């Protein structure tokens, strides 16, 4: 313990992924 | 360095002030927003009778609005948020603005992240101002037994007062629980019910409660789908939920065989986490559509499980989702523990060593 | 202090003086190895270091522990332990001084923009007369009934 630590009809499906 | 100003200069102090009545609401009555959503990304707080008003006056909305709402098409469907404040304002960029976006909720805004009591003003902020455009449901945290188990208590009585907390859970018991959307999607937190064969049992309940430990209510806030949903061995409909130790897990047959009674095309929920932030339930052989959509709008949850997070725009016969991911948010030590509280152990216990071993 | 108390200090205060200069230097409480993993160490060589010129003289040295007999009382104890936090001894731990002092005992096991986040949310909400800076009263306010006061005690 040398340094503190912190505690414990039908509709299309489209994706536009993450920017 | 400096003992007495702050070190590490790039990071802006948080005010202390507190905004006032004025201050938050308009010459009409209205919130503003825009005031509201600066000062709480900079962590600001409300003076107590402000934030007081904007539950009150969003529980009044709630309250006069139906068991199962009827909401048209377009509108933009988000999963859990559970007080990632942060992540709730990227959550508006990618969906698109309230002042111009139909929203559907779908409950658990708060519990889990510390920053829960801001997403519950601002979500009640933007219900006032956007009644009929914004819409809220309840999720199973959205009651006193989770709430009090997990942080959100403790948040409120840190930020504000445990009356800040009494009047969100009093706020909580008038949220909807379900939403009929463009008349095809059933809508819930969790999911279905052994006894809701019918929208009209959804329409019968009575909400305005804590939700029971077993019930039809319970299963709407609390269900799941089987683990092994679409490739049943398991031929009982609703079996014993073990994973949440109340309520049932449901199966496809008994998906299916409730879209076809009720005229539906999908439910649309929430309350398990993705990696991809959504998933793509087996299609119904009877529609060729997903009989089970989950979204799952907290990124990066519990700023672990690496996940993105997923909205749902349905718009012009599309289902667009929009993915996204997490964004920085502002260092608390868990349980909200102060820095002396966390570190006078370790001063204990340093300075003591030394002393035994100067000493010898 | 005991009268064999008094003699057992100065065997010792002249066994860690390695220059004879009859004076500790920081490189000479650094001479011990447990000492050289401590991350307190020069704090609590400058709070024994009660004038100011940079080394521990026996007067000092007794002082110092003293506070850390079992005679002493809790206020004793826990008034050591702001004084680890007060860097600039004016009787109020303030934000630079607390970030700096977390941060020795922290390292990085957080990174600086994490721990000024939470040092400025201490000062906030521990803060009541609103002078900006932790007074002992207010420290005591927050930590006094965790007793780590047990923990502070040495024999001699
Ligand atoms: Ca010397
Ligand atoms: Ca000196
Ligand atoms: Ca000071
Ligand atoms: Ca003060
Ligand atoms: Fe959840
Ligand atoms: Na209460
Ligand atoms: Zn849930």
């Known amino acids: ?19 | 360095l400096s003992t007495t100003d702050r070190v590490v200069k790039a990071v802006p102090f948080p005010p202390s002030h507190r905004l006032t009545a004025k201050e938050v609401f308009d010459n009409d009555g209205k919130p503003r927003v825009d005031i509201l959503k600066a000062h709480l990304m900079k962590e600001g707080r409300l003076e107590e009778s402000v934030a007081l008003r904007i539950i009150t006056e969003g529980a009044s909305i709630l309250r006069q609005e139906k068991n199962l709402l009827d909401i048209d098409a377009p509108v933009t469907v988000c999963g859990d948020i559970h007080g990632q404040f942060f992540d709730l304002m990227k959550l508006f960029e990618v969906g698109g603005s309230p002042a111009n976006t139909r929203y559907l909720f779908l409950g658990d805004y708060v519990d889990r992240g510390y920053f829960s009591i801001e997403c519950v003003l601002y979500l009640w902020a933007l219900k006032i101002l956007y009644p009929k455009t914004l819409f809220l449901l309840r999720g199973n945290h959205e009651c006193r037994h989770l709430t009090e188990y997990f942080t959100f208590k403790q948040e409120c009585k840190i930020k504000y007062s445990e009356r800040v907390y009494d009047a969100c859970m009093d706020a909580f018991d008038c949220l909807p629980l379900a939403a009929l959307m463009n008349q095809q999607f059933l809508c819930v937190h969790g999911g279905l019910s052994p006894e809701i064969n019918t929208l009209d049992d959804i329409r019968k309940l009575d909400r305005f409660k804590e939700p029971p430990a077993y019930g039809p209510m319970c299963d709407i806030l609390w269900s799941d789908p089987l683990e092994d949903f679409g490739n049943e061995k398991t031929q009982e409909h609703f079996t014993h939920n073990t994973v949440r130790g109340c309520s049932y897990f449901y199966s496809y047959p008994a998906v299916c065989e409730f879209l076809q009674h009720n005229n539906l095309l999908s439910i649309l929920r929430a309350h398990e986490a993705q990696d991809a932030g959504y998933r793509m339930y087996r299609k119904s052989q009877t529609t060729g559509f997903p009989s089970l959509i989950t979204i799952f709008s907290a990124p990066n949850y519990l700023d672990v499980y690496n996940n993105k997070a997923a909205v749902l725009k349905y718009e012009n016969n599309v289902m667009n989702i929009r993915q996204f991911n997490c964004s920085p948010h502002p260092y608390w030590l868990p349980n909200f523990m102060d820095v002396f509280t966390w570190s006078l152990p370790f001063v204990g216990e340093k300075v003591t060593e030394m002393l035994v071993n100067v000493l010898n | 202090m005991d009268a064999d108390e008094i003699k057992r200090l100065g065997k010792r205060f002249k066994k860690l003086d390695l220059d004879n200069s009859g004076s500790l230097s920081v490189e000479e409480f650094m001479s011990l190895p447990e000492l050289q993993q401590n991350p307190l160490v020069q704090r609590v060589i400058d709070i024994f270091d009660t004038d100011g010129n940079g080394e521990v003289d026996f007067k000092e040295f007794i002082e110092g522990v003293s506070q850390f007999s079992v005679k002493g009382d809790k206020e004793q104890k826990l008034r050591f332990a702001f004084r680890i936090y007060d860097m600039d001894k004016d009787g109020y731990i303030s934000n630079g001084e607390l970030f700096q002092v977390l941060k020795m005992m922290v390292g990085n096991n957080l990174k600086d923009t994490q721990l000024q986040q939470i040092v400025d949310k201490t000062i906030i909400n521990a803060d009541k007369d609103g002078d900006g800076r932790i007074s002992f009263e207010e420290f005591c306010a927050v930590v006094g009934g965790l007793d780590i006061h047990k923990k502070m005690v040495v024999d001699v």
Do not use: E, G, W
Not at chain 1, 1 to 19: E, F, G, R, W
């Open chain 1, 1 to 19: 313990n040398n340094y503190l630590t912190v505690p414990a009809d039908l509709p299309v499906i489209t994706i536009d992924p993450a920017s």
